[PDB]
């Protein structure tokens, strides 16, 4: 019995589907103020975090819940993406268990945070001469924000115990404040666009996660195959057979797997066990 072992292993998966367009979240024309941030929700797609990591254009990519390199292996039910613009000296506040005026009651991250945060400097779009007054932030609030809560009300904050009646006055502050984004500003006062991905694992089946890595096929050699999960060994060769449109693999007499269709060319292959004995 010349029971040899396969030369190597080959994995083959279907073609890359919809590319899950993050491009409208990172290359958007205008972001939102930190007090009113976007929460675009992702769904069934193929998320490619690889380009995000090796982009060589971001300043902060500190990632908390999961390892950056395992992003393409773990698979999640749903993914969110928050987006806003803040100052340089304030990006340090976008982290679990942090305090300040823009992390405490502008954007609170939970302690058990599992997603992670991206931020890059853009002092060429959000900063114009004379000031860019399209970017506001709240600096007064009755109470602290609980994690992942949005507040956009603009009732005049009453600091004291006097009635205030909707106008500014003694101990009546306007809740919001503007960023004086001027080109001539040192780092730490310049705008910083921030995107916060928050992966969710809900009781529903996972629909959003990374692409599978296929490899080139080999014929008439003994290898270890993996076609959409089913694994084993055997020679792969063409066969004058047919499968129904919806059926991927067949099971022979004595109920064993005998032929599988590779999900790249829709071509039928027979898994003949490598000659033994």
């Amino acid at each position: 019995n010349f029971r040899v072992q396969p030369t190597e292993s080959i994995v083959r998966f279907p073609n890359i589907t919809n590319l899950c367009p993050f491009g409208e979240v990172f290359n958007a024309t205008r972001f939102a103020s930190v007090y009113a941030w976007n929460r675009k929700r992702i769904s069934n797609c193929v998320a490619d975090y690889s380009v995000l990591y090796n982009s060589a254009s971001f300043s902060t990519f500190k990632c908390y819940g999961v390892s950056p390199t395992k992003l393409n292996d773990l698979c999640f039910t749903n993914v969110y993406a928050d987006s806003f613009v803040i100052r340089g000296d304030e990006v340090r506040q976008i982290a679990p268990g942090q305090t300040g005026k823009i992390a405490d009651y502008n954007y609170k991250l939970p302690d058990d945070f599992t997603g992670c945060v991206i931020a890059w400097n853009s002092n060429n779009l959000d900063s114009k001469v004379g000031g860019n007054y399209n970017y506001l932030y709240r600096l007064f609030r009755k109470s602290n924000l609980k994690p992942f809560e949005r507040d956009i009300s603009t009732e005049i904050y009453q600091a004291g115990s006097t009635p205030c009646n909707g106008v500014e006055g003694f101990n009546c502050y306007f809740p919001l404040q503007s960023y004086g984004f001027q080109p001539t500003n040192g780092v730490g006062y310049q705008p910083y666009r921030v995107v916060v991905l928050s992966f969710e694992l809900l009781h529903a089946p996972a629909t959003v996660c990374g692409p599978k890595k296929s490899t080139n096929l080999v014929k008439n050699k003994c290898v270890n195959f993996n076609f959409n999960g089913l694994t084993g060994t055997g020679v792969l060769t063409e066969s004058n057979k047919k499968f129904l449109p919806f059926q991927q693999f067949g099971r022979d007499i004595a109920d064993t797997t005998d032929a599988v269709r590779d999900p790249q060319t829709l071509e039928i292959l027979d898994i003949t066990p490598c000659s033994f004995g």
Partner: antibody
């Protein structure tokens, strides 16, 4: 760069009304915050009130309440400081200057030009 | 109603010396104090905001300090266009009161 073009000198009479405008040169308003400052002849500066143009909030100092009324026209980008019951001591040079959204912090960085209001009989 | 008071009243010096103005606050503005410069027949312009931040375009010789109720604006090297009236405003809370003024003269 923002500019604040203002009206011209207006000689008035006691007991009459004056309406000073402070048009923003460059189009319309934004999240600016505009405050009105007057300076008596040969004296210091005095702060009267401020308006939030886009958020629709405006009132004046307790000394000037019931007499001043600051309004804005976001379409034309023009803010007004109508002042009633003009008194002989109300003659001054009235300014308008943007100061940033909230009232604590930055300060008035872009000023108007001055609107001399001479009130006599 | 916070009352600001500047000192001294005129502070006349010579070109090239060092100036020192004070804006002793009455109450206790945290650190919100703006310094303005008004030349005769002109509009005031902002110099120092938040008591330590230099406004855009202002030369580096204007330096501000202080916190609480005692502040100070210091001009390191006077120049012929540095002689004007200097006002200080507290942007703590309603109403933003101004100060007296200081007509920096020329000595001879």
């Amino acid at each position: 760069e923002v500019q604040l073009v203002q009206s011209g000198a207006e000689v008035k009479k006691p007991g009459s009304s004056v309406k000073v405008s402070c048009k923003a040169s460059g189009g319309t308003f934004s999240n600016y915050g505009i405050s009105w400052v007057r300076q008596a002849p040969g004296q210091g500066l005095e702060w009267m009130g401020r308006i939030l143009p886009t958020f629709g909030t405006a009132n004046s100092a307790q000394k000037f309440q019931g007499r001043v009324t600051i309004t804005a026209d976001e379409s034309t980008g023009t803010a007004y400081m109508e002042l009633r019951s003009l008194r002989s001591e109300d003659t001054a040079v009235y300014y308008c200057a943007k100061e940033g959204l909230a009232f604590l912090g930055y300060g008035m960085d872009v000023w108007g030009q001055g609107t001399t209001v001479t009130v006599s009989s | 109603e916070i009352v600001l008071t500047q000192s001294p009243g005129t502070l006349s010096l010579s070109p090239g010396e060092r100036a020192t103005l004070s804006c002793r606050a009455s109450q206790s503005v945290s650190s919100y104090l703006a310094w303005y410069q008004q030349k005769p027949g002109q509009a005031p312009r902002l110099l120092i905001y938040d008591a330590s931040n230099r406004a855009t375009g202002i030369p580096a010789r204007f330096i501000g300090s202080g916190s609480g109720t005692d502040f100070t604006l210091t001009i390191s090297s006077l120049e012929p266009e540095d002689f004007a009236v200097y006002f200080c405003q507290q942007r703590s809370n309603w109403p933003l009161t101004f100060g007296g003024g200081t007509k920096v003269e020329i000595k001879r």
